[PDB]
Design a protein around this nucleic acid. Sequence first.
RNA 1: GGUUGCGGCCAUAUCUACCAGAAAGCACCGUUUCCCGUCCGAUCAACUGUAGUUAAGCUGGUAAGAGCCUGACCGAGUAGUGUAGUGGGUGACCAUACGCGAAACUCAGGUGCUGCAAUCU
RNA 2: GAGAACAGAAAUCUCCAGUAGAACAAAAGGGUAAAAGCCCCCUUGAUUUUGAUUUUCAGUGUGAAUACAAACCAUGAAAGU
RNA 3: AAGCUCGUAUCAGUUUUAUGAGGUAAAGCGAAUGAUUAGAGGUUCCGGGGUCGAAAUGACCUUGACCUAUUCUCAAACUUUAAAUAUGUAAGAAGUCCUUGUUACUUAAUUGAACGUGGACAUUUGAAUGAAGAGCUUUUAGUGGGCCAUUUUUGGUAAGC
RNA 4: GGAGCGGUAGUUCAGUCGGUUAGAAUACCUGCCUGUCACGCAGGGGGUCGCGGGUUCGAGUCCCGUCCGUUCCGCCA
Lengths: 296, 169, 159, 52, 58
Amino acid sequence: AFQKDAKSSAYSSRFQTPFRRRREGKTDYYQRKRLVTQHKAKYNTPKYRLVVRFTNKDIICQIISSTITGDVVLAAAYSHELPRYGITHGLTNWAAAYATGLLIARRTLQKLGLDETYKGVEEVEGEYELTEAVEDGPRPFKVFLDIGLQRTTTGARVFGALKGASDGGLYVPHSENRFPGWDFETEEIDPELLRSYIFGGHVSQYMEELADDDEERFSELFKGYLADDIDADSLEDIYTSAHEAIRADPAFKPTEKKFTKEQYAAESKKYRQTKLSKEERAARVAAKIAALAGQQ
Amino acid sequence: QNPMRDLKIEKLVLNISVGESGDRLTRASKVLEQLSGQTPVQSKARYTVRTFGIRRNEKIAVHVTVRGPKAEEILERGLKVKEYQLRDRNFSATGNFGFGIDEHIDLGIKYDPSIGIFGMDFYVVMNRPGARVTRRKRCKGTVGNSHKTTKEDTVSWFKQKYDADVLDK
Amino acid sequence: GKSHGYRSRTRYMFQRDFRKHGAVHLSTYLKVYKVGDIVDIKANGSIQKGMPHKFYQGKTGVVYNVTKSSVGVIINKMVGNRYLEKRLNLRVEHIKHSKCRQEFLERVKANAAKRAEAKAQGVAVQLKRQPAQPRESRIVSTEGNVPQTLAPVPYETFI
Amino acid sequence: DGDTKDDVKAPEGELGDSLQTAFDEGKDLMVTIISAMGEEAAISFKEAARTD
Amino acid sequence: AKSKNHTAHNQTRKAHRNGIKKPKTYKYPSLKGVDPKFRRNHKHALHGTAKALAAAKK
RNA sequence: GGUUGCGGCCAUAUCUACCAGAAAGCACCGUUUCCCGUCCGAUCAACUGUAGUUAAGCUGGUAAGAGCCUGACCGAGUAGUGUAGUGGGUGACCAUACGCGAAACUCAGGUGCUGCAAUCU
RNA sequence: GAGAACAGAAAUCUCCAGUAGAACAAAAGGGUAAAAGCCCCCUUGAUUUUGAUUUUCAGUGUGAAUACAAACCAUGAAAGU
RNA sequence: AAGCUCGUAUCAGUUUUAUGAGGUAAAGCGAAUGAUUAGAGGUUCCGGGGUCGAAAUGACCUUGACCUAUUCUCAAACUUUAAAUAUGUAAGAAGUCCUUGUUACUUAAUUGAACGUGGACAUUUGAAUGAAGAGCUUUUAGUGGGCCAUUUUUGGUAAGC
RNA sequence: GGAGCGGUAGUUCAGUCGGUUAGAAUACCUGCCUGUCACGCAGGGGGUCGCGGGUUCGAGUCCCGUCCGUUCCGCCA
């Protein structure tokens, strides 16, 4: 709208631009530095970070360790791959996040070999307990929670993702207070509420609450569930047998794709336009002087 | 060429500048409270003046940010004191507007003589859905020129519902 | 009176340099320092903790000790008659690697290869860097490119 | 801030006598004193004109 | 008594008479002000690795 | 090749004013019982991918645009400067030999590249 | 910059622009933008034992500072600090 | 001055090749910071003094700040840019690689880590030139009022200041 | 040729160096008294705290410069 305030020649010339990953607004550098910087006496020994991000209708979770060329992934795990584990609808919720975390844990440590040892907890009773130390035998694999920008509050699915991670074998150090059902008024964890949360108990209770409150909103939501024959008291058991679907075979089988990269290139390049040349530009300028200036 | 590019009220800020601290301000705070349904906030004087009478950081005025269907209610009944007649100014060049009124009594409120009389400032602020862009934490952005709230467009939107009179020079 | 603080006469030394303000970029921190490696010391005003003294700006020396977020560097300061060997404790942000040393190491790497090649040839190398030898006897070519004769140019006002 | 400390002996001062005289007439008596080396006695009388 | 206050004159010419003798370093440098932890570890390492060569190689 | 998450370098990437975007992707967008947090479900929280878009965002293109960059026998061997002279000059300073060597200006050329993992007619 | 009763050069509010033209206890210079700035939350690391180091230097002191250890704490979800 | 330990060491008031740091001379200000000469065009409802009008978010002149594009000029305590001269460090045996031992440190991991036995690679052993030896300790004298010259330069009108 | 000091209603001065306030005396003004003026009685106003800039929630007092006036030194030859 405005060109009276005027981003002038002078102002532009002496403008410093941030970093691209900050100019998008996607990477907190102040945090990132503090996170990734290794204790220099360890040398090349890398620091691994459990990246967890939540888009609208996906969860991304990836262990990354850095290198000055660019930050290299150890392994990745997504929520939209949960279909072949047996969870389809309602897939970016707290329980789903937990599941994703679990998958990433069991995956990375599977591919690193140890898995057999350091199975962690496999009760999932919602108790605050970390990956222990096996006396006589290798240390457990360590990795730190990278949130990025997603704000920290008690109850967030960020923390579900951590819970899933830690329980599934990977050492992520953490305090309890930001898991759901932490009593703020006195240092008293309730594991049973947390327990309920882990298997989508909040969601199931919500479904129960739309029995006689309203049943058009109920139809608006949960449409897929109605289609697939899913209901309240089945829900807690859906995540339960699906956890063992991870703990037998978590091995990452990628999609069949169909077509190859060249085909995709062929598709894409049709729509996006190329640049130009100098000659073409000069011609256009000539046209513009004919039409506007010379006036036919 | 108008599917998502719709228009609506984002929020409405009801405000009362009270020339001193303490009693009057507290009474105003009660006033806004029961009108809106939300409990208000109390702003501080940014610097010393003396000619007004106020000084540095004195807790001077009060306001409340109202949103949703609930703001529309108050806009209606309040807009009826000016009687569906605004001005050619009042609408800013950013596609927002406002109208000041006096006597809070003539918009639902009962007098109740311990309270008193206080004039109000309505400043309504507009948007097109998509203005999550600026206010969000992650992946902040600037809103493009074609999707901005202009003055003229806002005036049109106002005319179209409410049967509202723009009027004046 | 006279003044000699820890940052005496350092207006333009620790200036942050034009349009490169702030946000300590992250290559810096992942550059891995081994004991007994040569390092240059460009101080960095955008970090205050673990700073060098003004004297050591631009000065170069060997790393001796490592720690959590810093490195012990030794330098030969000149004082009175002699060289005295110091022991600094610079934070990693003020340091970069010696490019020259890296270059040297690469040269050494090539040297071994050259020696190996020579061996499969049957000895005789000549591996040292000789300077610019006084360039050889050659023949030029006129053919088309004739001596384009010049002259001196006369004095002219144009002012 | 606090109303404690009647002390301060009342003034020896002849100027403190006009204060002694003008008290019954009243009107916000604002009277400075000085603590210099722990010695404190009334120095000047002053009164605001309003404050209501 | 306005005497000459300071100069650095004819100082370099003193300096170069004996002449900027360099530190004269040794292999096995002095581990003084090297990380305590590291020093401790190295100690034990040396104690061990001596034993290996001493007991075995005979 | 596009697109996402994570990046390295940090504007050849930023800004101004416009126009294009199929697939998926994000993206906006629906809702507040629970965890959660606000003067306010705007923000952040959670719940739905269901109710709707490509209008914005993001990407790409355009402009004898700003800016930025890159080079040029472009200015210009210009200033300026290390070395020497019982060199010139009343001096200020200047020329000479051995060397070293800029900035503005002018012209032309460019307007992100690229690594890790995933996914897309 | 554009707007909102009393409201005016200025009192409160709201949007737009805004590379820093502010604010950082105090001189001046640096440094700082999801910040070292402002608002909130919880706190004593302004703690204990003794070295090593840099500065001014005679390479003594004093002061000031830096990197560490060994404790015991702080806060944070954590990386850390 | 006394020597001592060795006997071509590792060094050199130096260049070369390489790579660092610097913020001065220059330059720059139609680039920030300030300092400043001139008009042009805009601007005001958001400054006054007039003429046209009972008044007007008035018809029009005079200035006054502002804004835009241009202009002449500048800076020890201004700067995008940026020399020359001086300056740091490397030019390998205390090296490089191959195998593998050490540990109370560190690693998810006999991964790293520093230190190693063993094996290779030497007469261009890894730029120039020079080395009336190289290194090393003792002790003690006098000294601690300076001055002139080239160029750089501060006060000062200037001075054999 | 330097050092220190002063700065306010129309006048003499406090206030002021302590920063979120300008007081006394006289003069001036009004009414009253009085044949009329003085004296008195009862009320009232009047000072951008010399000027300009800066620091400051706030400057009249805090810092710097002109500006106009008062002081101190001018010794040994």
